[PDB]
Design a protein around this ligand. Structure first.
Ligand SMILES: Cc1ncc(-c2nc(Nc3ccc(C(=O)N4CC[C@H](N(C)C)C4)cc3)ncc2F)n1C(C)C
Length: 278
């Protein structure tokens, strides 16, 4: 860590993140100081992450095990959240929404093909640059936001799948379009009940095995599903078709990252450059 000069704190569950300059090489980096107490398994788990390289995953440059674990990442200048708040006035243009969605699906397609899950996608851990790229960061690597949590997690599923990232990404997609969070819950039951009010209470019809999941209660209110035209106007038919498949209750019916990439929504996909003020 002596080789690095802290420029500024840029983020603070498990670990703080600093913009920092490599004292030798003048290299500017994000320097993550990880949740102190290293367990041997966590070291081999991060050594697996260093091999997981993709243009839509923030590059882990180095892991400094001394003695206090640091992770040195490629630096990116803004998160999606700040860009969304800076764009809240006319909204992010749809071409740029489509681009960001396609790229993150490509990152997820990659992660998932190697049986790596993110587990905690949100606007705060999606990082953007001046060239139109968007990148996954801060991989969930087993107050916190529940807003992008898949319903299987919230109902107590222990061995959940790659479909949790598709759910989260779908929530992020809707939020980019509408400029309002799709399920802004302030507790697990509120989060869950917000998902239920909008998409209807899941039963064995739409989600086989649901009534036997740990935190499922026969006594949950039974809400009727709302229209998707009510939920994400002004998303077009393709956009809404894709979103509905990313928000299927049954993790096994929820569209994969790979299948999603072939959806007609991306037919006219391009790569716009955003107007970013750094
Ligand atoms: C948790 C984590 N590990 C590694 C990184 C990381 N960050 C950056 N650079 C970066 C991130 C966020 C912002 C940013 O716009 N703000 C963070 C807080 C505030 N927002 C919540 C409104 C704005 C600027 C630069 N680069 C590479 C990384 F690996 N991160 C970030 C997600 C903070």
């Amino acid at each position: 860590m002596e080789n690095f000069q802290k420029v500024e704190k840029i983020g603070e569950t498990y670990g703080v993140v600093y913009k920092a300059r490599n004292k030798l090489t003048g290299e500017v980096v994000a320097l993550k100081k990880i949740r102190l107490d290293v367990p041997s398994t966590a070291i081999r788990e991060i050594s697996l992450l260093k091999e997981l390289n993709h243009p839509n995953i923030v590059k882990l440059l180095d892991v400094i095990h001394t003695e206090k674990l640091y992770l040195v990442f490629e630096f990116l200048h803004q998160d999606l959240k700040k860009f969304m708040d800076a764009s809240a006035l006319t909204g992010i243009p749809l071409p740029l929404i489509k681009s960001y969605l396609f790229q993150l699906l490509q990152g997820l397609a990659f992660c998932h093909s190697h049986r790596v899950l993110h587990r905690d996608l949100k606007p705060q851990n999606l990082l953007i640059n001046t060239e139109g790229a968007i990148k996954l960061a801060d991989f969930g690597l087993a107050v916190v936001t529940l807003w992008y949590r898949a319903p299987e997690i919230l109902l107590g599923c222990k061995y959940y799948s790659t479909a949790v990232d598709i759910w989260s990404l779908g929530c992020i997609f809707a939020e980019m379009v509408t400029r309002r969070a799709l399920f802004p819950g302030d507790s697990e039951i509120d989060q869950l009940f917000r998902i239920f009010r909008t998409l209807g209470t899941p039963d064995e019809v739409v989600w086989p095995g649901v009534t036997s999941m740990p935190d499922y209660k026969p006594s949950f209110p039974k809400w009727a599903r709302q229209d998707f035209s009510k939920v994400v106007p002004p998303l077009d038919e393709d956009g809404r078709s894709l979103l509905s498949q990313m928000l299927h209750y049954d993790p096994n019916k929820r569209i994969s990252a790979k299948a999603a990439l072939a959806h007609p929504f991306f037919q006219d996909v391009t790569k716009p450059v955003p107007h970013l003020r750094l």
